[PDB]
Amino acid sequence: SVSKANVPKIDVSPLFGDDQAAKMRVAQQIDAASRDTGFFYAVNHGINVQRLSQKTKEFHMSITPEEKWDLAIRAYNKEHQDQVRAGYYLSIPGKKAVESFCYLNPNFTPDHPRIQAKTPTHEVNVWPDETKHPGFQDFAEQYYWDVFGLSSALLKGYALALGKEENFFARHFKPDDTLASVVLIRYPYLDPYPEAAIKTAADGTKLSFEWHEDVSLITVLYQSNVQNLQVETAAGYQDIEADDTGYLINCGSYMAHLTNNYYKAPIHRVKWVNAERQSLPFFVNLGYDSVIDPFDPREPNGKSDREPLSYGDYLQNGLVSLINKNGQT
Ligand SMILES: CC(C)[C@@H](NC(=O)[C@H](CS)NC(=O)CCC[C@H](N)C(=O)O)C(=O)O
Numbered sequence: 001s002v003s004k005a006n007v008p009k010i011d012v013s014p015l016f017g018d019d020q021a022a023k024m025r026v027a028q029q030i031d032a033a034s035r036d037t038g039f040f041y042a043v044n045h046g047i048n049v050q051r052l053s054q055k056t057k058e059f060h061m062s063i064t065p066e067e068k069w070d071l072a073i074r075a076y077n078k079e080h081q082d083q084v085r086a087g088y089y090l091s092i093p094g095k096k097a098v099e100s101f102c103y104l105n106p107n108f109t110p111d112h113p114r115i116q117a118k119t120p121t122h123e124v125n126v127w128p129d130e131t132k133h134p135g136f137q138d139f140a141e142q143y144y145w146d147v148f149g150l151s152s153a154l155l156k157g158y159a160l161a162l163g164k165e166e167n168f169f170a171r172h173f174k175p176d177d178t179l180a181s182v183v184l185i186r187y188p189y190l191d192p193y194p195e196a197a198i199k200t201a202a203d204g205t206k207l208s209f210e211w212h213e214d215v216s217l218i219t220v221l222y223q224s225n226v227q228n229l230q231v232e233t234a235a236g237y238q239d240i241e242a243d244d245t246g247y248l249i250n251c252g253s254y255m256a257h258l259t260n261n262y263y264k265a266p267i268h269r270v271k272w273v274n275a276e277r278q279s280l281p282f283f284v285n286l287g288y289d290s291v292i293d294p295f296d297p298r299e300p301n302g303k304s305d306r307e308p309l310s311y312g313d314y315l316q317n318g319l320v321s322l323i324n325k326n327g328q329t
């Protein structure tokens with residue numbers, strides 16, 4: 001018998017306003033969720049998720065093998081040595097079902113100083129041909145800034161929840177240098193479904209992606225309406241109900257580090273379900289040099305003995321570790 005996780009729906013609209021007490025009431029709800037299962041749905045967020053889903057589906061269903069090779073990351077195309085993060089992550093017919101397209105900050109151009117310095121984790125996005133995918137790049141870049149704006153507001157909520165001024169996290173989340181990424185993931189319907197793409201957990205559950213903590217400050221996720229996620233609790237895994245009108249929010253391991261595990265990064269996994277669906281995360285990453293001094297909200301003085309960790313070092317190590325543990329996606 002698998003139980004269902006308590007995942008509250010939080011109206012985040014006050015975080016865009018100037019009613020300070022209303023913002024505190026949202027923060028209290030974020031705090032409560034972050035100390036319980038670690039997940040909540042953000043509702044009344046203002047993002048046109050219908051258009052997001054439609055445009056993503058048009059892209060996934062119309063891109064051809066030729067185009068996928070041309071956009072592929074270095075794991076799938078040895079010619080693209082500069083594409084570790086950004087580009088197309090191919091499926092492998094009969095072996096690997098999932099495929100995805102990842103893009104980074106649109107402001108990362110050949111002229112950007114971090115690109116000119118060849119700083120790790122910064123890359124210039126690759127895009128399909130405008131004539132084959134009209135409006136796709138325009139849509140995707142605007143979506144990046146829309147979800148950036150929602151994420152900025154959420155970070156104000158997290159700061160207030162922890163007793164800090166509302167710009168405590170957001171001041172490090174800047175359009176000019178954020179390492180945040182969008183991933184447009186297609187999980188396909190397949191018949192027969194390749195057995196190599198199904199993992200069996202210790203408890204017998206069939207999975208598409210094994211247990212992990214997120215490499216992020218927070219993760220801001222839109223998924224279509226097919227139940228798939230489970231969160232670990234002390235009493236075992238619990239199902240997270242789907243909601244295709246809201247964003248599912250959780251903390252990543254950078255938040256756990258800087259709060260001395262007061263807000264844990266929830267361990268979660270993806271159940272195998274044979275259904276055509278979309279999983280569209282935005283990983284809220286800071287800048288390469290961003291450092292937040294850790295603190296412990298449990299102590300009156302907030303003192304922590306944990307070392308400050310540069311976000312760039314955290315991200316570089318975290319991305320590689322996730323591939324080594326859970327496989328190349
Ligand atoms: C659980 C979902 C978020 C999704 N999984 C995922 O997106 C998983 C686990 S959080 N994430 C990753 O592989 C990290 C992608 C990082 C990205 N290439 C980048 O360079 O920034 C899924 O549906 O499998």
Ligand SMILES: [Fe+2]
Pocket residue numbers: 212213214268
């Ligand atoms: Fe995750």
